[PDB]
Symmetry: D2
Subunit: 141 residues, 4 copies
């Protein structure tokens, strides 16, 4: 699968290379039911005009990583998972190198899963944290 | 260039190469208390399941709120940056546009706070995103 | 009903005057399905040791007001409503007088309702805002 | 008096009369990077349905995070106050205790950020509450 997203269905409405994710280059490294990690190389496509990594990039990386780590478990159970809320706090700017994300599952309820995502730069500093609440619902189709 | 506020003579990254230029955000109106922006939905704004990406609502809110604060404080020697964002997703968007309206609710000496509503073509509320914006002295 | 909370059941596990709400003195003024208002007189019981209204008081008032405004609609439909998340931002301290809250319903989904609560002082200044997400689930008993 | 940090000679409100003294919060450990507190559940901490009040988790997180920051910055001429709190409720608590553990995750010059886990007697995670704490020069 492109970007290493979990391969859980035969076809997807939008190919990975055309999505926001494939455009900026998000890649999943490890993925388990309780923990997943992903990273992205910073290029201008991830920056805003003042030269820092965009606020939206940290949110998008957290959202994809936490939701897909959820999809990877629940999809075969006949469920979908979508992001329901995201709370992100920005501690230090990233200007270049990579952003690495580590998502840790802190609650798995029957309707809601909750993941804490830490976003670090190449020196290992904590630049942002992003909490994701993921809704889990029976598939429609 | 997106109609972002033109406050400086040079910018490190050109608008068309930024995340904002890549997905196509454009500012429509901008005043100190209220700003609006919009974007057409294309695959670049979607995730693999075909819905507008969670990141895209957050990106829009953050650019709009922060640049609407830049518009006011830059000429005063201040920089403005997003410090936190809280986004809640009520209804997905599949196609058409996403239209954002940011309303300034607090303007403190060190922090401004904006509420950003994000609506689809039918005018339905699809997400809200609160942005807290830190305002600090420019570093020379 | 004590504090003017919606009267939706014959008996409640804890009487109003013994609850956190009745202890600090929260009172509901208006209540509709899309809008509710409440207030509280500030006394030391609502303050922290440095003399300001406690952070917890703004959250508690928002949580009670948004959840009960939800209970008032859904209870007779056989549902319960509980607070699922709360995000509060504090703009200006309140030292005395009253805190008045106005909750406005911004989304009513089939599993989740979302209320924005503004908290003002007696001069009408906006001192805090508190977003409440309320989960709505079938009753257990 | 709750074991709060004793940083000043006089406090405007005595601990037993504060919201914190009224519901019974007590600090157990406090270091610059980590603090713990607990409270017994009584009706005063509950809402009318018999569950611990949403406000009670938020109150606990906010007092603990802020006072753990006071402990460090007060002697440096700074005051600390809660600037935002985000609390998510995973499982209700009906009786027993609520035990809070606050871990400092960022300590910036103007903002500190703490994550506070709130657990019941069985040690289950019932809520988490992130606290952002503004740190500013004391006003004389
Ligand atoms: C928000 C805040 C300024 C608060 O500061 P703090 O908690 O007191 O932390 P502190 O001030 O100790 O600084 C930590 C790092 O902040 C940076 N910083 C702090 N103050 C300043 C300043 N006055 N000038 C420049 N950098 C600063 C600096 O990198 C610092 O490290 P150091 O160089 O001092 O070692 C700091 O945490 C921070 O800079 N966070 C990152 C903000 C960020 O990166 N947000 C996302 C990007 S801007 C939002 C956005 O998406 C956008 C999009 C499009 C668009 O067109 C415009 C904006
Ligand atoms: C979260 C929730 C499911 C909760 O539902 P609710 O608050 O109870 O609202 P309700 O169920 O009344 O539904 C409102 C709308 O949600 C949709 N919805 C609700 N349940 C379902 C379901 N089981 N299946 C499909 N759609 C549903 C539906 O569109 C509905 O409108 P209608 O067609 O029923 O009129 C609904 O609010 C919602 O869908 N919010 C939008 C979720 C969203 O779009 N999040 C962001 C995108 S997914 C996160 C992400 O960024 C990501 C990125 C990359 C990647 O690879 C994976 C994910
Ligand atoms: C957080 C912040 C300091 C950020 O400031 P800002 O966004 O730049 O706004 P600005 O600085 O323009 O000031 C607005 C108001 O803030 C207050 N303020 C701001 N800076 C200061 C300062 N250095 N010293 C004293 N007051 C200040 C002041 O009242 C101001 O109005 P004015 O007198 O200047 O007209 C300001 O918004 C604020 O004070 N918010 C209220 C904080 C609050 O009330 N939080 C809850 C109480 S403390 C958290 C807690 O629950 C706790 C519980 C138990 C316990 O034992 C300890 C703590
Ligand atoms: C929000 C939610 C219902 C979502 O469920 P989820 O994330 O899918 O988790 P799941 O459904 O797996 O359930 C976990 C636990 O929640 C409880 N729960 C879930 N569904 C139900 C239900 N339909 N009925 C009763 N309890 C339920 C149950 O305790 C469960 O454990 P178990 O007994 O099933 O092992 C669950 O996370 C939860 O209950 N969180 C706690 C809610 C809470 O305690 N909020 C604060 C208090 S209510 C807000 C308030 O402050 C207020 C104040 C004054 C006032 O007058 C009114 C309200």
């Amino acid at each position: 699968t492109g970007g290493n997203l979990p391969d859980v269905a035969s076809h997807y409405p939008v190919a990975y290379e055309q999505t926001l994710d494939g455009t900026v280059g998000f890649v999943i490294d490890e993925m388990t039911p309780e923990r997943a990690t992903a990273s992205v190389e910073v290029t201008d496509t991830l920056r805003q005009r003042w030269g820092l990594v965009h606020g939206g990039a940290y949110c998008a990386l957290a959202a994809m990583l936490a939701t897909e780590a959820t999809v990877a478990v629940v999809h075969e159970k006949g469920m979908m998972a979508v992001g329901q809320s995201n709370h992100t706090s920005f501690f230090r700017p990233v200007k270049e190198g990579h952003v690495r994300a580590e998502a840790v599952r802190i609650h798995a309820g029957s309707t809601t899963w909750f993941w804490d995502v830490s976003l670090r730069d190449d020196a290992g500093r904590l630049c942002a944290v992003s909490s994701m609440s993921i809704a889990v619902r029976p598939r429609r189709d």
